Design a protein around this ligand. Structure first.
Ligand code: HEM
Length: 291
């Protein structure tokens, strides 16, 4: 398929900055969610899940179509718990009905990251809602109970290299696993609603113990009360992965830069931007605007 970005008719930067501010103010306000973690983390997960269905082989899936809006994709077992990010954005969509779904879903991710003190993520508008028949079949999102080979192989479908895989996974610093959703339980660290390189430090510095949880799945448990999925853990089992983990554990800046690039790339996979298309926008945070 060819997916050409098409700017929402007559909208500019300022229009988008308003959508951004709307999400950000709601993030600030609905702070009681998930025991006071807030919605930030679920939004980031939602932006990754709508983008992660992409197949570099036939150009299907990815964020373009806003297909998560369809039952098929919405009811993907792997998307369990995302309905919360969805209901968070609805009221927003209602307020700015001209924005396409794909644009909204992906912007929430950017907004969440930036408002949780992460790096600035350049964003591009132009995703166009596609018909329900362009909805990708379930089973394109990765399993958690695998090793580094699985991960490398998987990520290759999305065109991501080692560096990109490790950068993107540092997103695990945010939120936590929910038994009910995924069959895994516990956060990855302490500051789970602030974007930092905590993930890498926990990985390197905790004394991880393999145990089975109440869903009868194996997870790495630390005495600090943290957990790591087998897929997380595999970042230290693979030699190529481990040196990158180390780099990030050592330099939060480097990690921020790598994440930034990788995240935008993830969100733009499968989209063709005509040369006349506007440059990537860099939204200001509420704080930068004095709001
Ligand atoms: C091997 C690849 C990955 C696997 C197997 C994986 C698996 C999971 C699982 C099982 C959960 C818990 C869901 C729940 O029970 O609520 C989760 C949560 C999360 N995922 Fe990952 N993930 C992967 C990659 C990513 C990437 C690339 C990102 C973004 C860059 C990401 C962002 C998140 C966030 C922010 C959460 C926490 C959400 C919350 O607190 O509701 N994950 N992931």
């Amino acid at each position: 398929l060819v997916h050409v970005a098409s700017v929402e008719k007559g909208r500019s930067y300022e229009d988008f900055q308003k959508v951004y501010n709307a999400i950000a103010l709601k993030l600030r306000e609905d702070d009681e969610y998930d025991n006071y973690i807030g919605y930030g983390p679920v939004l980031v997960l939602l932006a990754w899940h709508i983008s992660g269905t992409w197949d570099k082989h036939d150009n299907t899936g990815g964020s373009y179509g806003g297909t998560y809006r369809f039952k098929k994709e919405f009811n993907d077992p792997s998307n369990a718990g995302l309905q919360n990010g969805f209901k968070f954005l609805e009221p927003i969509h209602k307020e700015f009905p001209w924005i396409s779904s794909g644009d909204l879903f992906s912007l929430g991710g950017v907004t969440a990251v930036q408002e949780m003190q992460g790096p600035k993520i350049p964003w591009r508008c132009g995703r166009v809602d596609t018909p329900e028949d362009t909805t990708p079949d379930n089973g394109r999102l990765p399993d958690a109970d695998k090793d580094a080979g699985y991960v490398r192989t998987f990520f290759q479908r999305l065109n991501m290299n080692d560096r990109e895989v490790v950068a993107l996974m540092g997103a695990h610093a945010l939120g936590k696993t929910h038994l009910k959703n995924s069959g895994y339980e516990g956060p990855w660290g302490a500051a789970n609603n602030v974007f930092t390189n905590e993930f890498y430090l926990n990985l390197l510095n905790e004394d991880w113990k393999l145990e089975k949880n109440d869903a009868n799945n194996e997870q790495w448990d630390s005495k600090s009360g943290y957990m790591m999925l087998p897929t997380d853990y595999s970042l230290i089992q693979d030699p190529k992965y481990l040196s990158i983990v180390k780099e990030y554990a050592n330099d939060q800046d480097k990690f921020f830069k790598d994440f930034s690039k990788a995240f935008e790339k993830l969100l733009e996979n499968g989209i063709t931007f005509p040369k006349d298309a506007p440059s990537p926008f860099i939204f200001k945070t509420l704080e930068e605007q004095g709001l």
